Structures are given as C-alpha cells and as structure tokens.
Amino acid sequence: GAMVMRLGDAAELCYNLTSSYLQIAAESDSIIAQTQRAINTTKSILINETFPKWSPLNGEISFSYNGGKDCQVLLLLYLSCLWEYYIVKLSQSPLTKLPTVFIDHDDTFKTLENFIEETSLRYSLSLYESDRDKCETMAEAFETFLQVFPETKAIVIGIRHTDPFGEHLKPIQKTDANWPDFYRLQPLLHWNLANIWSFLLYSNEPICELYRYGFTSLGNVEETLPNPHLRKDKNSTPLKLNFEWEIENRYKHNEVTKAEPIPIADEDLVKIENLHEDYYPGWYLVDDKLERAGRIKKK
Ligand SMILES: Cc1cc2nc3c(=O)[nH]c(=O)nc-3n(C[C@H](O)[C@H](O)[C@H](O)COP(=O)(O)OP(=O)(O)OC[C@H]3O[C@@H](n4cnc5c(N)ncnc54)[C@H](O)[C@@H]3O)c2cc1C
Ligand SMILES: [Mg+2]
Ligand SMILES: [Mg+2]
Ligand SMILES: [Mg+2]
C-alpha cells in the first residue's frame, strides 16, 4: 500500500504465515511435513533456549543478514518467534527496528546489495553494513561492529550443517578464539535445501531474483554461476518441480502486507542473459550436495 509495514505488522505477518504453513495437511513422507518439523525445531531453539537468555529487544542480539535464501527464511522464522514469544505467549520484557548486520564486500552482487536494501525497508531492519571498500576478514569486520555496539552478546546466523564447515556447529555456541567474543545463534542448522525452498516459496515474500535465474548459492560476483545441474537442454531428462503446491497456494497478502517488486539488477541481468544457456530457477534443485555447484573452476 501507501506505506511500509511497521515492525509489529511484519512480525505478525511472519507469525501468521508460519502458522499457516504448520497447518498444511501434508503426508508423513513429504517435503512439507519435514519442513514443518524443521520449523518446530527452530522455534524451540529461539523460544525455549534463546530469548529467555538474551534479549532480542535491547540490542543484546543482532541478526546477520545478506539477503540470501537461508538467512531470509531464518529472518521470517525469527520475526514469527518474536511475535509468538511476546504477544502470543505473553513473555516478560516499543521496538521499531530489528538490529541487523551485513558484512559488505567489493565483489558482492549488485542484485544482492539492492535486495538487502529493499528488504531492510520491508522488514524494518536497522541495518549496519560494514565498509565495502575496506580489506578486512569477516572476523575483523565483526570486531569493528562490536566496538560500535558493545551491548551485543549474540548474533543470529542462517548457516546450515550442509554448508562448508557446518558439520560440527551447534545451535548456541561461542565464536572461535580468533574471532571477537560473542555467542553464535544458529537455529537453522537442521534445514536442508528442499525445506528452504518449500517454506520460502509458500511465504510469498520477495526472493532475491538471482535464484529465479538459476543460482542456488550466492557467493561473490566472480566465482558464482547459475547451477550447471539446472541447465536446460534438449537431450537430458527435464526437471520436475517439487514446489508447485506451495507456489500455487502461497500465503495471500492484503493492502498492508503486499510486496513491492525487487528486480534483478541490470548489471547482473546482462551477465546472465549473455550466457548462451538457460537455467531452471534454483528451486528445481533439492540435492544439498549440489547446492554449491555453480562456481568457476579453480586450480
Ligand atoms: C556472526 C557470525 C559469526 C561467525 N563466527 C564464526 C566463528 O567463530 N568461527 C568460524 O570458523 N566461522 C565463523 N563464522 C563464519 C560462518 O561460519 C560462515 O563460514 C560464513 O558466514 C560464510 O558463510 P558461507 O558463505 O559459507 O555460507 P552462506 O550459506 O552463504 O551463509 C551462511 C550464513 O552466514 C551469514 N552470512 C554469510 N555472509 C554474510 C555476510 N556477508 N554478511 C552477514 N551475514 C552473512 C548469513 O546468516 C548466512 O545465512 C561466523 C559468521 C557470522 C556471520
Ligand atoms: Mg546459505
Ligand atoms: Mg557501505
Ligand atoms: Mg552464500
């Protein structure tokens, strides 16, 4: 409509859409049923283990966000859990913006930069962005962040066990010794790729449009390609879509919640359209072993 949602509207939206997903009558061997179970585990981590220990309201928690599919799903679930914890469950504790941190780099996709900005508006994020043109490690960028915000005790991260170095991660654990000292809150670890697509497509939230063009994992602009397993060709078996129901039945909006388009950036569209190959969108990939296949070959 005429104005951006307030944080309470966004949180209530996320609670309603998550609740609606949980009410889908899905077969016990389905992706949707598995995703419902994943939601419930994430909710337990946030509602039972996280919020009672660290305040999401007063700056003790910041949310790490770069606009990708995994941290976007987590943000939706996190907003749902804020609403459930405080409004539905009446837990003891107004917040206008959610403290958020993005580590920006000189080789980030322009589409992602745009999508982070536009979703920060939609979700009422209070967005800290590290310096794009400073050469520094992620740990060093977070050390600066913690100097600015020394009240921060914990940061939410949308990492999954299937990501590199994800095997041994835990839902709540300290950073390593060579990092600034804070707790990592990692409530998405048990999600797999099929779960991410199912929920994100059902949500009817805007999704970074690189995924529409066949990306399944967003690394830097030089290394990242559309996923080769999603290349269209005349000779191979055509891919089938596992998420037709979710797209057809995606959560409906009203005048407050309707979403403005977040288009692909022109500079990325030129690049993609000049591959001489076309790709299915990323949600045609459900094999976690192949999530990072769209990368330039290195020696
Ligand atoms: C707050 C935080 C604390 C960390 N602490 C440790 C640590 O103690 N030891 C260690 O070895 N590694 C640490 N890491 C690194 C982390 O484990 C991943 O290796 C890193 O986020 C890059 O992820 P990826 O690109 O492989 O995967 P992706 O799947 O692309 O990203 C996984 C998640 O990382 C976060 N993320 C990735 N890139 C950015 C970015 N540019 N800005 C903000 N968030 C981003 C998002 O929440 C995202 O969902 C930390 C990362 C973060 C964000
Ligand atoms: Mg990811
Ligand atoms: Mg900047
Ligand atoms: Mg990535």
mmCIF file of C-alpha atoms and ligand atoms in Angstrom, residues 64-66 71 101-103 105 138 142 155 157-159 163 175-176 179 182 184 292, ligand 1:
data_model
loop_
_atom_site.group_PDB
_atom_site.id
_atom_site.type_symbol
_atom_site.label_atom_id
_atom_site.label_comp_id
_atom_site.label_asym_id
_atom_site.label_seq_id
_atom_site.Cartn_x
_atom_site.Cartn_y
_atom_site.Cartn_z
ATOM 1 C CA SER A 64 23.352 -11.413 10.469
ATOM 2 C CA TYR A 65 21.730 -10.877 7.070
ATOM 3 C CA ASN A 66 22.955 -10.776 3.476
ATOM 4 C CA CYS A 71 19.049 -16.030 6.258
ATOM 5 C CA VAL A 101 24.390 -6.667 10.440
ATOM 6 C CA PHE A 102 25.586 -7.200 6.877
ATOM 7 C CA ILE A 103 29.271 -7.695 6.011
ATOM 8 C CA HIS A 105 32.376 -6.725 0.149
ATOM 9 C CA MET A 138 34.823 -11.276 8.398
ATOM 10 C CA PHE A 142 32.633 -8.084 13.273
ATOM 11 C CA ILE A 155 24.398 -12.879 16.678
ATOM 12 C CA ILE A 157 23.358 -16.772 11.628
ATOM 13 C CA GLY A 158 21.476 -18.702 8.894
ATOM 14 C CA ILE A 159 24.172 -21.356 8.493
ATOM 15 C CA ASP A 163 27.297 -25.567 4.426
ATOM 16 C CA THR A 175 32.745 -17.947 18.483
ATOM 17 C CA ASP A 176 36.240 -19.365 18.000
ATOM 18 C CA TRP A 179 37.047 -14.123 16.432
ATOM 19 C CA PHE A 182 30.107 -13.457 21.210
ATOM 20 C CA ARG A 184 26.601 -17.638 17.653
ATOM 21 C CA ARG A 292 27.418 -25.013 -4.445
HETATM 22 C C1 LIG B 1 28.003 -13.640 13.087
HETATM 23 C C2 LIG B 1 28.965 -14.664 12.544
HETATM 24 C C3 LIG B 1 29.859 -15.302 13.411
HETATM 25 C C4 LIG B 1 30.738 -16.257 12.917
HETATM 26 N N1 LIG B 1 31.656 -16.860 13.806
HETATM 27 C C5 LIG B 1 32.497 -17.833 13.289
HETATM 28 C C6 LIG B 1 33.422 -18.466 14.129
HETATM 29 O O1 LIG B 1 33.507 -18.219 15.346
HETATM 30 N N2 LIG B 1 34.274 -19.399 13.576
HETATM 31 C C7 LIG B 1 34.255 -19.694 12.259
HETATM 32 O O2 LIG B 1 35.069 -20.538 11.841
HETATM 33 N N3 LIG B 1 33.355 -19.092 11.431
HETATM 34 C C8 LIG B 1 32.520 -18.128 11.921
HETATM 35 N N4 LIG B 1 31.613 -17.565 11.074
HETATM 36 C C9 LIG B 1 31.639 -17.862 9.593
HETATM 37 C C10 LIG B 1 30.443 -18.718 9.189
HETATM 38 O O3 LIG B 1 30.541 -19.974 9.848
HETATM 39 C C11 LIG B 1 30.400 -18.905 7.662
HETATM 40 O O4 LIG B 1 31.618 -19.525 7.287
HETATM 41 C C12 LIG B 1 30.271 -17.532 6.964
HETATM 42 O O5 LIG B 1 29.108 -16.849 7.420
HETATM 43 C C13 LIG B 1 30.192 -17.593 5.437
HETATM 44 O O6 LIG B 1 29.095 -18.448 5.137
HETATM 45 P P1 LIG B 1 29.021 -19.167 3.703
HETATM 46 O O7 LIG B 1 29.241 -18.085 2.876
HETATM 47 O O8 LIG B 1 29.921 -20.375 3.572
HETATM 48 O O9 LIG B 1 27.542 -19.683 3.560
HETATM 49 P P2 LIG B 1 26.150 -19.000 3.230
HETATM 50 O O10 LIG B 1 25.249 -20.156 3.136
HETATM 51 O O11 LIG B 1 26.210 -18.032 2.064
HETATM 52 O O12 LIG B 1 25.894 -18.093 4.535
HETATM 53 C C14 LIG B 1 25.544 -18.731 5.770
HETATM 54 C C15 LIG B 1 25.070 -17.658 6.739
HETATM 55 O O13 LIG B 1 26.127 -16.785 7.096
HETATM 56 C C16 LIG B 1 25.649 -15.431 7.236
HETATM 57 N N5 LIG B 1 26.370 -14.647 6.244
HETATM 58 C C17 LIG B 1 27.085 -15.084 5.155
HETATM 59 N N6 LIG B 1 27.636 -13.997 4.551
HETATM 60 C C18 LIG B 1 27.273 -12.884 5.229
HETATM 61 C C19 LIG B 1 27.530 -11.532 5.067
HETATM 62 N N7 LIG B 1 28.276 -11.051 4.079
HETATM 63 N N8 LIG B 1 27.000 -10.670 5.988
HETATM 64 C C20 LIG B 1 26.242 -11.129 7.008
HETATM 65 N N9 LIG B 1 25.966 -12.446 7.193
HETATM 66 C C21 LIG B 1 26.495 -13.295 6.299
HETATM 67 C C22 LIG B 1 24.136 -15.458 6.942
HETATM 68 O O14 LIG B 1 23.456 -15.529 8.221
HETATM 69 C C23 LIG B 1 24.028 -16.711 6.131
HETATM 70 O O15 LIG B 1 22.714 -17.238 6.143
HETATM 71 C C24 LIG B 1 30.745 -16.608 11.562
HETATM 72 C C25 LIG B 1 29.855 -15.954 10.689
HETATM 73 C C26 LIG B 1 28.971 -14.999 11.180
HETATM 74 C C27 LIG B 1 28.027 -14.337 10.204
#
